[PDB]
Symmetry: D2
Subunit: 116 residues, 4 copies
């Protein structure tokens, strides 16, 4: 698992469950092409997005559909979504965890990049 996404809810102190996440890779013509997607699990996690073979160096965008999440809870949110845009770099073996901490009018995102 080279790429994992974790989403947490700072209003309820809980994982953010059933949040849609879309991953895109930047193509040669500068457009964002779909790469992977899914919904966070009961633990707020989305695993199984990609494989080492597929996850080549490039610019990726992770879009987290925060608005739908807050609307399902009845809470008016600020953002349309949260976006995390980054370059994947081969620099020895690497695993990326993209975490997002959600509030209605704020989010924080962190990247944890480790070498198994």
């Amino acid at each position: 698992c080279p790429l994992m996404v974790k989403v947490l809810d700072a209003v309820r102190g809980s994982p953010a469950i059933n949040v849609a996440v879309h991953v895109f890779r930047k193509a040669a013509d500068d457009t964002w092409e779909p790469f992977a997607s899914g919904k966070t699990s009961e633990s707020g996690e989305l695993h199984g997005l990609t494989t080492e073979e597929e996850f080549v160096e490039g610019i990726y965008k992770v879009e987290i559909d925060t608005k739908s999440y807050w609307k399902a809870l009845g809470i008016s949110p600020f953002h349309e979504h949260a976006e995390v845009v980054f370059t994947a770099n081969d620099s020895g073996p690497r695993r990326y965890t993209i975490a997002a901490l959600l509030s209605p009018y704020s989010y924080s995102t962190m990247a944890v990049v480790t070498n198994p």
Copy 2:
């Protein structure tokens, strides 16, 4: 201002100075049209991006060019940029302060919305 951006540097404990910011507005054909741009001042603030008249209802994207900021300080950061996407003015004119707190592998963004 109807729209102000504030950027802080969590490594130095200081405003993030000379940070480029680009604002886009979603057009009718679903593309991102350039709306306004500028650079943060010595206070980390960017004022004067738009006017009440020009800042109509819409979906806006504020793109903060964090990678360029970090690289100039000798840090190879994770993100390409910090992006903030939001519907504005859809219940009438509001004032928006978009704040970002930057670290090399993390950022936080908060919006303060006020009714004039």
Copy 3:
């Protein structure tokens, strides 16, 4: 001010108004002596806590009474308070802005330190 505190509410997208703040300074016997206190204004800001003369070198604690804030808005929050503990002025007088961004189960705090 040599010391200013700013508190924001990430649920409402607004300043956190009427938030009690208590400042303490570590005394020679290792106890926390009361130093200054106040409440945030309608801008979420608390000014006028101390003076350059009184704000000597020391270890200071800024305690932000977040639980009381949340409870008054109908939220049962996680934290008792947000605490910020720091050495101040140990290479001469500085100005400190202590910012806090509040959610019910999370907060962020950032310090901006400037040399007058």
Copy 4:
């Protein structure tokens, strides 16, 4: 494991390893008594602090020695430590994860409270 602490480093995009953590419980005389302590693992995690039997309702403080961590990396930090103060509440079965995201001049903390 009713109580777990996770510490992340936002400057390096990594777990924060070998960080000292101390847990205290508030005693009847309002003083903080040592409860549990340890050092974060290679994954930034500290497990095994307490047991269900021991971890009774009360006010707890988790102190994370951030200053020592940044000093070991050569990075000048703002905070003496990070503190997380909270009430444990029996409200059905409960597990607490206290996460901290560290930068030199900022930290964020989040509590994830779940029911196995």
